[PDB]
Amino acid sequence: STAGKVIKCKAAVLWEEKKPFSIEEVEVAPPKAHEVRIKMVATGICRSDDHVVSGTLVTPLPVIAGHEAAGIVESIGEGVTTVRPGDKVIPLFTPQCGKCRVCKHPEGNFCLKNDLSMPRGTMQDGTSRFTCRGKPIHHFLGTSTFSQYTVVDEISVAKIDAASPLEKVCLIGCGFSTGYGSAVKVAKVTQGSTCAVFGLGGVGLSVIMGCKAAGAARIIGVDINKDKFAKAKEVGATECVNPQDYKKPIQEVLTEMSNGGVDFSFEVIGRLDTMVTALSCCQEAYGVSVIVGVPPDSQNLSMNPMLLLSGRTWKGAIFGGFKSKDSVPKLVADFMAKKFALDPLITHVLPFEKINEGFDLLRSGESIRTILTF
Amino acid sequence: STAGKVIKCKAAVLWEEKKPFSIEEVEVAPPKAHEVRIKMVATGICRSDDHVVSGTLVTPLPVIAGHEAAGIVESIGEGVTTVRPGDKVIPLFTPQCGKCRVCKHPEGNFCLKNDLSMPRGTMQDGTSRFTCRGKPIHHFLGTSTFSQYTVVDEISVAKIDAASPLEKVCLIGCGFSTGYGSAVKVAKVTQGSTCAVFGLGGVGLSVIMGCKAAGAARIIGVDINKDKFAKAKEVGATECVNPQDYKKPIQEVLTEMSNGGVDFSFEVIGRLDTMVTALSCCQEAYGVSVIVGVPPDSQNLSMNPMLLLSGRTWKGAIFGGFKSKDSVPKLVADFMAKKFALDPLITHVLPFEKINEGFDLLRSGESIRTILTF
Ligand SMILES: NC(=O)c1ccc[n+]([C@@H]2O[C@H](COP(=O)([O-])OP(=O)(O)OC[C@H]3O[C@@H](n4cnc5c(N)ncnc54)[C@H](O)[C@@H]3O)[C@@H](O)[C@H]2O)c1
Ligand SMILES: NC(=O)c1ccc[n+]([C@@H]2O[C@H](COP(=O)([O-])OP(=O)(O)OC[C@H]3O[C@@H](n4cnc5c(N)ncnc54)[C@H](O)[C@@H]3O)[C@@H](O)[C@H]2O)c1
Ligand SMILES: [Zn+2]
Ligand SMILES: [Zn+2]
Ligand SMILES: [Zn+2]
Ligand SMILES: [Zn+2]
């Protein structure tokens, strides 16, 4: 590789729902006007990457999954204004643009032009940029960063520093700034409150380290893996609760702690049952429960409209409700400026091709955010 | 009146779920250690007064219903200097205390010294204050305004304009406040927006007013009573709609109209399926649905956590987010300035006794607000 024409690199194609990844030879076509193929350096193993091997998150397979990654640019397209090559850029699973009333609303985020609410499984014109044996393989959302190269459009490529830790700063293309932005944007943790965070994972530590900046005098953590409680207390997690150690329902306990309920509560697992237990555990009259997580598809939660009627605002968010192409660059100069710490999350840093133990740590248990290097 | 100890009067009791109100003579005792006794001037028939009757709003029985009323004091108890005898007052159904959380909280409206979350038959003391026969009759909210005289609790009551129409302002006890309180305080309707309004009657008419004052351009109101479609323009609306004129779900009709979806979708019906159809009806990524309406008993509803994940916020509220003892005073006071209208809401002033007719005027469609003079 490198070029103007077809690069013949390596990738990790899913060919089938519930099987490991086949590291392979695929051939990434040179970009198409307003696209920007990017030479991948580092990637992150999110869950929403694993929801795809189970099929809890449904996208057209066969596909080069991956979406939370950093890398450097080589080739750009026609009329491309935003990033020039040799550029460190970080790919955007939720794009930005300019027109669609959501891109033009003070409080939007979720660009009409996504591929998350009902997936085509391709580029922005309907075609691939990934051909394996002879069969084009599907891109995911609009990043596919488990290749050695990828070709993203222009509206979903953010351009950061140039002295930036991409073995670090790749947790901003998702991981951190969705759990961060939830707590400080979407929920808006009031200075001095009681926060309960269900799920103490990658995204759920950033949400507790968003509350802790928001002021938050208290912050509890609920995980059924007491093993997670440390990286947690260590992040600014005051009281950790394991629902398994308890006889009575957990909303109660959670609600007997802060009795009345916690000002704010966040669900970062994505279970229809916890997605409600988190709503029940806050305050009738002014309890703001937000859901970050991603449930098993077309699945319905059985809730009581009365839960909401006393005065609880229920929200949701993809990303941190962070306007993608002017919030990801801005959010790096900060890390670089010791605004936060990306290190306490990261538990491993594996070579790409072992990307199958990578998933198997995450899911096969405790060991929170690995970073496969390319 | 000769006020010092017990009285007898006419009350509209509801001995049984499903049967009309019997205007029995009822003997109402003196205000105790803190309360105030009131003789009623007027009352409106709010649907919630109808719910107790169906079996969908379960407070204990037998009970004097009613909660939307203005009157003047008679008696007044001990440890008091809030409202003195011969002083207009509006009974309140969601009290205050200034004691509790929600009350001390700048944004809490659900006091937590109330009887709608866990109806009791009341009286903070835990007691009687009504006996129709030799049988004690129950209180509806800290109120029961369907009797000639009732004796509330000083925590749930309020002194007002002195030179104030208790025949125009008994509607500031619910109907109008909640309608308008839910659009201007709990939705924080915006200017330029398009709010859709489900249910074009009592309260849903006041919501079509904040929506007009909050300062917006399109207020689309949806009812199954084409007949209800003009007050709705008089008082605000532009477009009016009927789900029965349609081969397509009303969700959609309404989602192209604002195509992209509405901005601020309200529901003031009490329909568990209308609660969702409106969830869905606002912008996937920045729409706010305020559940106004009071649902069936402990009947739950279904939806998938992705209507919320995309960005819509789903709040709810009682009264209209309006604290209790600080508003009805200043609200009424706004009326006097002819700062808002209270008549396009009122269609029938019927004398009490003639109550089992105003109810019979609801259930039909001939009535919006049938005020019950005394
Ligand atoms: N809204 C968005 O844009 C967005 C962004 C990123 C991730 N997500 C989703 O949020 C979730 C969190 O992502 P992640 O990478 O940190 O996942 P993860 O698997 O590493 O985290 C899941 C965590 O929840 C815990 N957990 C499991 N069952 C639990 C239960 N019953 N009660 C409490 N805790 C329980 C696990 O022990 C673990 O700590 C995923 O489902 C992901 O898909 C959404
Ligand atoms: N949250 C609170 O504190 C509060 C305060 C007051 C009233 N409420 C509740 O709000 C609701 C509205 O009360 P109201 O006094 O205005 O009642 P109302 O009878 O005057 O209003 C109901 C209206 O909605 C219309 N409607 C019903 N089903 C419909 C459907 N499927 N599709 C379209 N339109 C439909 C009906 O024709 C009727 O005109 C009730 O359930 C009441 O109990 C709640
Ligand atoms: Zn856009
Ligand atoms: Zn992710
Ligand atoms: Zn209170
Ligand atoms: Zn009412």
Side-chain angles (χ1 to χ4, degrees), chain A residues 71-92:
Chain A
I72 296 107
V73 192
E74 123 207 30
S75 214
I76 74 208
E78 256 244 315
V80 172
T81 68
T82 99
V83 335
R84 297 186 190 209
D87 258 29
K88 319 235 277 221
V89 296
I90 61 179
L92 304 173

Side-chain angles (χ1 to χ4, degrees), chain A residues 95-104 109-114 155:
Chain A
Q96 161 151 152
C97 70
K99 195 264 146 91
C100 79
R101 229 8 233 271
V102 184
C103 262
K104 242 179 204 185
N109 176 273
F110 204 42
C111 181
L112 252 42
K113 255 149 214 164
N114 55 285
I155 54 165

Side-chain angles (χ1 to χ4, degrees), chain A residues 5-317:
Chain A
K5 212 102 147 93
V6 177
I7 301 260
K8 206 249 168 201
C9 73
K10 185 134 329 238
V13 141
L14 221 222
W15 277 117
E16 158 177 22
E17 230 171 62
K18 284 244 226 100
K19 310 195 106 141
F21 284 93
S22 224
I23 301 205
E24 314 223 319
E25 293 151 45
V26 303
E27 86 230 34
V28 218
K32 244 201 207 137
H34 289 124
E35 271 155 49
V36 161
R37 85 124 89 86
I38 294 151
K39 156 115 186 321
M40 283 298 154
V41 179
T43 354
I45 324 166
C46 206
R47 198 60 183 225
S48 252
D49 261 353
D50 180 20
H51 290 321
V52 173
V53 355
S54 356
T56 269
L57 165 22
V58 172
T59 170
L61 299 186
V63 73
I64 323 281
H67 70 275
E68 184 204 284
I72 296 107
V73 192
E74 123 207 30
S75 214
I76 74 208
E78 256 244 315
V80 172
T81 68
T82 99
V83 335
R84 297 186 190 209
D87 258 29
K88 319 235 277 221
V89 296
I90 61 179
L92 304 173
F93 73 79
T94 300
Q96 161 151 152
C97 70
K99 195 264 146 91
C100 79
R101 229 8 233 271
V102 184
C103 262
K104 242 179 204 185
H105 182 242
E107 213 251 36
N109 176 273
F110 204 42
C111 181
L112 252 42
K113 255 149 214 164
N114 55 285
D115 189 72
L116 207 233
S117 70
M118 78 123 38
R120 309 217 228 82
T122 49
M123 206 72 194
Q124 227 224 10
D125 40 43
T127 84
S128 240
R129 211 108 337 184
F130 285 132
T131 350
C132 212
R133 284 139 204 232
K135 306 196 251 105
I137 288 138
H138 270 115
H139 326 199
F140 169 11
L141 290 168
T143 66
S144 303
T145 54
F146 281 3
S147 233
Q148 239 146 33
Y149 291 80
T150 216
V151 181
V152 329
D153 261 84
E154 194 189 356
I155 54 165
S156 46
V157 59
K159 182 218 157 185
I160 92 258
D161 217 310
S164 334
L166 310 191
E167 229 197 81
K168 247 92 202 67
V169 102
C170 90
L171 246 11
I172 271 173
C174 205
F176 174 66
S177 54
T178 91
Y180 189 70
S182 276
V184 145
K185 235 222 191 239
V186 174
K188 286 222 154 147
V189 188
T190 87
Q191 145 139 54
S193 23
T194 300
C195 304
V197 189
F198 288 66
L200 296 169
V203 181
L205 275 174
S206 323
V207 152
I208 115 171
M209 58 179 282
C211 300
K212 216 237 184 316
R218 193 122 158 258
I219 293 187
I220 332 208
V222 206
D223 212 304
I224 58 147
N225 194 192
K226 52 86 106 242
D227 268 15
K228 305 248 150 89
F229 290 175
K231 225 129 110 118
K233 309 225 169 114
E234 191 216 321
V235 262
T238 262
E239 194 154 10
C240 275
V241 25
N242 177 184
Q244 269 174 148
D245 294 336
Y246 293 110
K247 244 114 127 39
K248 35 162 357 152
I250 246 299
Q251 319 123 60
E252 303 211 16
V253 191
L254 248 260
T255 42
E256 240 194 294
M257 249 160 241
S258 221
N259 207 114
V262 338
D263 287 89
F264 307 79
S265 87
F266 310 77
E267 208 272 14
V268 224
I269 300 123
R271 272 193 92 161
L272 290 344
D273 70 340
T274 296
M275 206 157 299
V276 137
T277 314
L279 212 215
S280 253
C281 90
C282 51
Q283 255 263 154
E284 306 163 309
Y286 56 91
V288 181
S289 153
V290 174
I291 88 188
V292 176
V294 171
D297 235 50
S298 298
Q299 229 110 265
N300 299 168
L301 60 84
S302 235
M303 135 202 239
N304 196 124
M306 238 278 139
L307 226 37
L308 270 204
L309 205 105
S310 353
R312 301 163 150 114
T313 117
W314 218 4
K315 288 180 182 129

